C-alpha cells in the first residue's frame, strides 16, 4: 500500500515524457536504448518459438511499443495496468482519439528492424486490431488479475517491461510478484521480461517511486526459482547521454523466458 500510495500522483504524460521522447526516446542513434530494447523484441519474435493466441502484457503503463513485434503471433492480446489514468491512456491511442500520445516513430522502427517491408501503419492497425481489453490489475495479489477476468486465461505467453522492480520494495516482493505473474502464464508458455538494472527510483511528474535495484543474477535466479528455463538474458548499460534526472537507472535487462512445466 506504500507503493500503491506513492502511484497515485504517477503522471502518464511526464512517465512518457521522461522515457519515451529524445534524448532516451531518441529511435535514429543504433546505440540508443530504444533500437535495443526493440531489436531484443523482434528478434525473439522472429525464431518463431514465441507463439499461440493469447497474450497478456503485465503493467502496460501508457505505452505500446512493447507490443509492437508481439502483435503479429498472437490475435487475442490484453493489456493492463494498476492505474485508471494509465488504462485511459493507453484507451486514447488504441481509439485514435484526442491526445493520443505518438507512437508513429517506434512503429516504424519494429517495421525496420524486422525488415519485413511492412508499413507502419499497418502495423499500428494490427496491435490497435488484436488488443482486445485493458483491465486493472495488482502483482501483489495471488491472482493478479483478479476472480472472474474477462482475459483468456491461461496465457500463452506474458509480456511485462518495467513493473515489477518499479512496484517491488526489496527482492522478496520481486519474487513473489513474479510467482503472482507467472501463474498466468499456462505450462510451457513463455516469458518476456524488461526492466532496469540497479535502479531505486525514479519521477513520474509530481510521483517519486521507489524502486528495488536488481541485477543481471538476481532476475536470473529470480526467474528459476519461479519455475523457468532463462533462454535468453542480455543487458544494456545506460550510456552517458541517457543518464538525466529523471531516475538513476545503471542499466536495462532482457529476459526470454519459458515456463518449464
Ligand atoms: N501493484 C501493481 N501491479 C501492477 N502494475 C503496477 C502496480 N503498481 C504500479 N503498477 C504500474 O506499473 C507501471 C510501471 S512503469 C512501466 C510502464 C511500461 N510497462 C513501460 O515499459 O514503460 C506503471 O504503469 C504503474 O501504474
Ligand atoms: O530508457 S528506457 O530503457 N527505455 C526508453 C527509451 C525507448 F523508448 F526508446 F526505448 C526506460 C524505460 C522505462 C523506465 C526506465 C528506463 C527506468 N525507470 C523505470 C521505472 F520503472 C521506467
Redesign the pocket.
Known amino acids: 500500500a506504500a ?2 500510495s506513492a ?1 497515485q500522483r ?1 503522471e502518464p504524460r511526464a ?1 512518457l515524457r521522461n ?1 519515451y521522447a529524445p534524448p532516451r526516446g531518441d529511435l535514429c542513434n543504433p546505440n540508443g536504448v530504444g533500437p535495443w530494447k526493440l531489436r531484443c523484441l523482434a528478434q525473439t519474435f522472429a525464431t518463431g518459438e514465441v507463439s499461440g493466441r493469447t497474450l497478456i502484457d ?6 505500446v511499443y ?1 507490443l509492437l513485434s508481439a502483435c503479429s503471433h498472437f490475435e487475442d492480446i490484453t493489456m493492463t ?3 485508471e489514468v ?1 488504462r485511459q491512456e493507453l484507451g486514447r491511442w488504441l481509439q485514435e482519439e484526442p491526445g493520443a500520445f505518438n507512437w508513429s516513430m517506434y512503429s516504424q522502427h519494429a517495421c525496420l528492424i524486422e525488415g519485413k517491408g511492412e508499413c507502419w501503419q499497418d502495423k499500428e492497425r494490427q496491435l490497435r486490431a488484436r488488443v482486445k481489453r485493458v483491465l486493472p ?4 495479489q495471488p491472482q ?1 488479475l483478479g476472480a472472474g477476468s474477462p482475459a483468456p486465461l491461461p496465457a500463452d505467453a506474458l509480456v ?4 515489477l522492480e ?2 517491488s520494495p526489496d527482492l522478496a516482493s520481486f519474487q513473489r510478484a513474479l510467482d503472482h505473474i507467472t501463474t498466468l502464464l499456462r505450462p510451457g508458455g513463455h516469458l518476456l521480461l ?1 526492466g532496469a538494472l540497479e535502479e531505486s527510483w525514479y519521477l513520474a511528474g509530481e510521483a517519486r517511486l521507489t524502486v528495488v535495484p536488481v541485477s543481471e543474477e538476481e532476475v536470473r535466479e529470480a526467474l528459476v526459482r519461479s519455475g523457468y528455463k532463462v533462454r535468453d538474458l542480455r543487458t544494456y548499460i545506460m550510456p552517458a547521454h541517457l543518464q538525466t534526472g529523471v531516475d538513476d537507472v545503471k542499466g536495462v535487462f532482457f529476459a526470454w523466458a519459458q515456463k518449464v512445466g
Not at 58 to 63: A, D, L, M, V
Not at 137 to 140: E, F, L, Q, T
Open positions: 507503493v500503491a502511484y504517477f512517465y522515457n503485465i503493467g502496460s503503463g501508457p505505452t512493447q495496468d494498476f492505474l494509465n490489475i495488482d502483482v501483489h493478479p511485462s517491461a518495467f513493473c518499479a512496484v524488461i
